[PDB]
Every structure is written in structure tokens, then in C-alpha cells.
Design a binder for this molecule. Sequence first.
Ligand SMILES: OC[C@H]1O[C@@H](O)[C@H](O)[C@@H](O)[C@@H]1O
Ligand SMILES: [Ca+2]
Length: 768
Amino acid sequence: DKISHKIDIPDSAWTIGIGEKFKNAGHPNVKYPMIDDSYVQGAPLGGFGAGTIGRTYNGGFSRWHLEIGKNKYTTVYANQFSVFQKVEGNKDGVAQVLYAGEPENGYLSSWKWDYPKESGMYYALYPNSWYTYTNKDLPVQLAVKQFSPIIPYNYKETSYPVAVFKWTAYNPTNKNVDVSIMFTWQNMIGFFGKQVNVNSGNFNKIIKDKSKDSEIVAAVMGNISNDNEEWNGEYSIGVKKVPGVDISYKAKFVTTGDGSDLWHEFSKNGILDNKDDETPTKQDGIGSAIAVNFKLQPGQTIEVPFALSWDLPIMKFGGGDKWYKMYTKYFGKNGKNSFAILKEALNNYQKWEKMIDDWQKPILSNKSKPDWYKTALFNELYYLADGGTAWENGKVGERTNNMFGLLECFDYNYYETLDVRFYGSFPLVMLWPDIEKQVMRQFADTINVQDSSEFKVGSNGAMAVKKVQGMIPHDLGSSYALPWIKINAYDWQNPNIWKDLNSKYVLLVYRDYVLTGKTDKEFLKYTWKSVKTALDKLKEMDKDNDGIPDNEGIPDQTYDTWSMKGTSAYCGSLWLAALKAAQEIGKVLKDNEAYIKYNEWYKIAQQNFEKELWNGEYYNFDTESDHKDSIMADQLAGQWYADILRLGDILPKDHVQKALKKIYEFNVMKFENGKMGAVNGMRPDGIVDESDIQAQEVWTGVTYALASFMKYRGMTEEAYNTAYGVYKMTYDKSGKGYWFRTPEAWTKDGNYAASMYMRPLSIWSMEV
Ligand SMILES: OC[C@H]1O[C@@H](O)[C@H](O)[C@@H](O)[C@@H]1O
Ligand SMILES: [Ca+2]
């Protein structure tokens, strides 16, 4: 491996061998259907709201999130980088697709498949990833750096449906070598959204943009129709000319054939026919190819950038609503702009690399932090793009704001699940705060919505009212229905009687003020009515007048199969913190009567909480359940947020410290020797609480948040050891292979529930 030294991959990048088999992989810990796309994954390409494309460590373009809200795992075999090399003085060169696999059927059988094992590596430090190719039969060593411009505090480039592939090629041998690199792409118009004749009308054109010191050659893969529909638009691939390289292309090869129409050209001498052909297809799949060819002398290096763009302007949700995607603000709405996007990338990629480096540098350069922690911190951010992210720039047919939503996950297809975003939204408040405040104003606007229609509650089969006035919604809808318009898609429980949503909502509001400088009084003003309403409604759920809402002996909070009854440590601490936040907001906005009321409620609830739950060692799970003395990992979630919000002690320092030490001692260290995170429930005898599946799970997001709590409280070793188990399980060779699909949960056997989950974005609470 002589190529690594010629590129700059950080040591904290996650790494795996190209073609590596992973033996230990986990699978769903449930008996009903659940997504399991395998461990063959990678860091996504594509911006927020753009649709994303998962290119795996084996080289395939395989995890398709281009249909917003849907996860489709299928390798489009025509989509590849291929290489040709010929040593000066040999009769023949060699040609190889850079994919460690082959097609299932006989399409593209002429291409050279099965890139060999032990001949390259994949690296990822989101938004960047890299492949190196160090192969006995390829004397010139190659690497590629691939990325999209995901940039904190930038709402423009961060939205773009674009990816850059910056190639570096180096000749360590003492012979001249002819090298070609070829990008192939299928015209994927009709891959989704088209009900009949899925390829019909697809056609490919070549654009040559020749201007002083800037030659770009690109293929634009579109359809003859000017229909403005979800399925219509364009893909583009292309390359920028650099000194010492020639460009060749082929406009049209048949993807639903043996591929030899293209491959006989490339495998001969690495030079394509330069044949333009705009003839539209009927039934056959078609694709385009862009190649560079160059001669490398001994010791010579060359760099050449390719790019990929996709202009699919309209997202349609299952309820019928069609919206424009955010990037259309910058490039237009008509779906004929893929070249402009591609060109912008090829002329600006060096700047984008520097912008990415500039935001990663403060963490990467801090040598007090272990590399494993940086691996997790950056790579968990994949979910911000990969989470079915919707970011609208107007309803089709139809404002100053652009509504946003991140899915909880794909198995539970709900936007912005609030009980989860309480944990998962840290990267948005810390790196894209304008998006975060927008989402919270979306929630504010729903507080007094009433939808008196009824739904069947999944857990018990009773009927309930969809949305109650004054209760914060569980979610902002589903991609199968109407995101932003029809809220509370979730129906397993009735979220209108949840005891955590209203408090978490208030805590989220005050968090968003504090973590953006305590300057945004306008945001506090916009949300103030909803904050008062939320706490006032929750107060009414105090049945026994101890000043604290009563959990009802059903799952009435985020642990939606784990019953709480009476005063719970979890909802009770959240209520206390929420009251303290509202007091502070009241002070900021000069609402004296609110300050006084919430101060009084707080003082009464605080003393009762402590009396009812403090047991000498930790806070009891709750007051009334069968295993009320279980040690809960999240028992002091309210105090965690109070630390972040700088609200001080809601409970005595000494008791918080004792509780945290107990959780570390029991829920971490007595659960598989502390190598897997914090189990949610542990009995005081040191045995996992088996009262529900949830008690017996580590929740990845709960564990990272608890690590954050431990860290702020000076338990530095415990904090990082607690988080390490999550990192290990996700990324390490000894783990369960969950990279780029971090799940909600695992059980002690390592098997999982709900891959690709929002909650573990909470790792960013460790950077406050
Ligand atoms: O895994 C627990 C989670 O399950 C999801 O289906 C629900 O939408 C969440 O509210 C809940 O916290
Ligand atoms: Ca009560």
C-alpha cells in the first residue's frame, strides 16, 4: 500500500477490507417483520432533503433513499467505477470493475466482476469516505475520496443532490503505465414512482462545457417527458479535465443486456467510442459512461474529479401531497438541472473539502479524545442525511420557512418523533440550529390542534381521539401518509396521555435557546404559549395531588411497552426540569405570574419526588409497579437536561452522583462486563429486569446520553467506558456489524431492534 501516503485519511476513519466477510453479524431480536439489510453498507452520499444513496464498502450503489421516506436495498449493478491498466511493453492491458461482487443474473456478464479480496480498503469519516485499490495485477495504485458537502451552519450546499469522487492515481513501479478510470451509471428515471412502462422515454445526452481552463464532459440521463411528477427528472455523471488526461464517453449502453457494447471498448485500451445517441428507449434499460485515460510515468501522481448529481425535484408522500425538495431553491424546480448541479460540484469541490476539514478539525485535533470516540461522533451523523429526511421548498401547485423532518427510523416511519428527538436532535441544535428551531416551531403550532376522529390503539385495541388540544403530538406524520399535515401517525399507544411528551417539548425549547447563545428571545416568544399550555395540561394528570403527573400503569412514555405507575423517576425528573425551564423562560420574557406558578409547582414536586423515590443509593423506577425498585439507566433524564440547560441542581448533587455510580456499577458493569452499553433495567440483586423486552435492552441513544450526563458530572472514565460499548457493538470487528445503521436497541446476545434509528444521534450531547 503506497497510495495512502498520497491522500489524507484521518486515523479515526472507520475501516474495513473491500470484500471482507463479517462473521458475527446481528439480526432482529423480534418475531415480527423488521428491516435487515445486512452489514454491506457505507456512508451515504447526498444532502439533506435531497434523497440519499448508500454506496457500500464493497463499491456498490445499494441503499436507495431517493424516494423520500423509503429504504430500498438493491444493488444497481450498472453503477460502478471501473479501471483499465496496461504496462508499456505488454500486448494486453487488464480491466476490472471496482465491485467485490457480481450480478445475480446475466446482465452485464461481459464486465469483469468480483474485485478480489485483500486488495483494498474502505474508510469512512462522514461526510467523507474513501476506497484504496492496492492490487497485485494493477501496478498503478488508486484511491478515491467521495463526499457530499454536508457543512454545519450552511443550509445551501448541505441540501444538494450531489456527490464528488476525487481520484488519486500513483505509479510506484519503474515502468510507464496507461491508466483509465470509468464511471458508469444507469438512467434510473422510473426506478421509483412510475406505475407503468418504467424505462419508456428514457434518453441520454452528452454535454461538453469547454471554457478557458475548465473542460467538463457530462452525461445527462433523463426522459423525453416534461411532466412534473415525482418520478421525473435527471441524473448526471461527469468529469473535469485536468492536465495530462483525455476524456472519452459513451452516451448509451444497454443495462438490460450483456454490457459488451461498452466493455469491448474499455477492456481493449480504456478508451470509449465517444458515440452520442439521444434515441429514447422503450423497454430496455440504458446507461451512460464517462472515462479518463492517462499515462503515468514512474513516481508520478495525478488527481482527477468526477461527480454525480440527481435532479428529482418532487417528493410525493403516500397521502398524495407533493412538495418541492429544498435544493430546488438554488437550481430550479423543472427537473432539467442536473448538469448545473454537477458543474457547481466539479468547479467548487476543493472549497467544499476545505469547509468540511474546517468543521471536523476542532474535534480531530483534540488529542485528549480517543480516536474511537471521533469515529462514532462523525459517523453517527450519517443518519441526518439517511433518515428519510424531508425539507420542503413549497407544495406543488401552491411562504418564508421550509418545513423539515427526520424520521425516527424506517420500521416505524414517523417524522420527528418527539420522545426520541429529545435525544436525537443534538446535532441539529449544535450544527444546523435554524433547522432545529423550525422543527420546534412546527411542534409549537400543533399544541392546540384537536382532531376528534378516533383510531384503534394497537396495544389494547381500544378507540381513542387522534389529537387532544394542549397535548404535544408524538410525531408529525408518516411518509406513507401526510408529513406535517396529519400528525400522530403513531398508534401503538395513545400519545395524548403520555407523561413525557409535554415536558420533553418544554425542555427542547429551552435547550434550543440556551445552546444557541441565550439570545433568541423571539424563539422563546413564539413558543411561550405552547410551553405554558403543555405544562398546564400535564399538571391535570396528577391524580393524588403530590404535584407530579401520575403514570397510569400502562406504557405512557417513550419506553412504549414498559409500564410505569405512580411517580416515576423518568417522567418525574423530566417534569421537575421542565418546570425549572419554564420558570427561567418566564423570567426572560417578564411573565411574573408564570414564574411564580411554576416556581411553586416545582418546589412542591421536588420535595415529593425526593421523598417518594430516593432510597439511599439511587432513585426508584417508580412508586407503584411490581418491580418499582429496579435501577433504571435513564432514571435522572431530567437532571441530565438540566445540566445541559444550566438550570442547576434539581436533585441533590450527592444523590445524583450516587445514582450515576450505581447505574455504572450495575446497568453497565454487570451487563456483559460493561462491553455493550447500559441495560435499561436492572434489579438491585444485579440481575437484568425481565419484566419487559425494553428493560432487558440497551438503547443506544439512552446510553450515549447517559455517557454525556456522566461526563458533565466528572465521571470521565465511566462516561467513556459506557459509550465505548456502543461504539464497539456498532463499529468494531468484535461487534455486531451495525455501521451506518445504528439501531435503537440490542439484547445481551447482541441482536437488535430497529436499525437506522434517530436516537443514537444523542452522542453529540457529549460535545456540549
Ligand atoms: O423503541 C421505542 C420507540 O418505539 C417507536 O415505535 C415509537 O414511535 C417511539 O415513541 C418509542 O420510543
Ligand atoms: Ca401524582
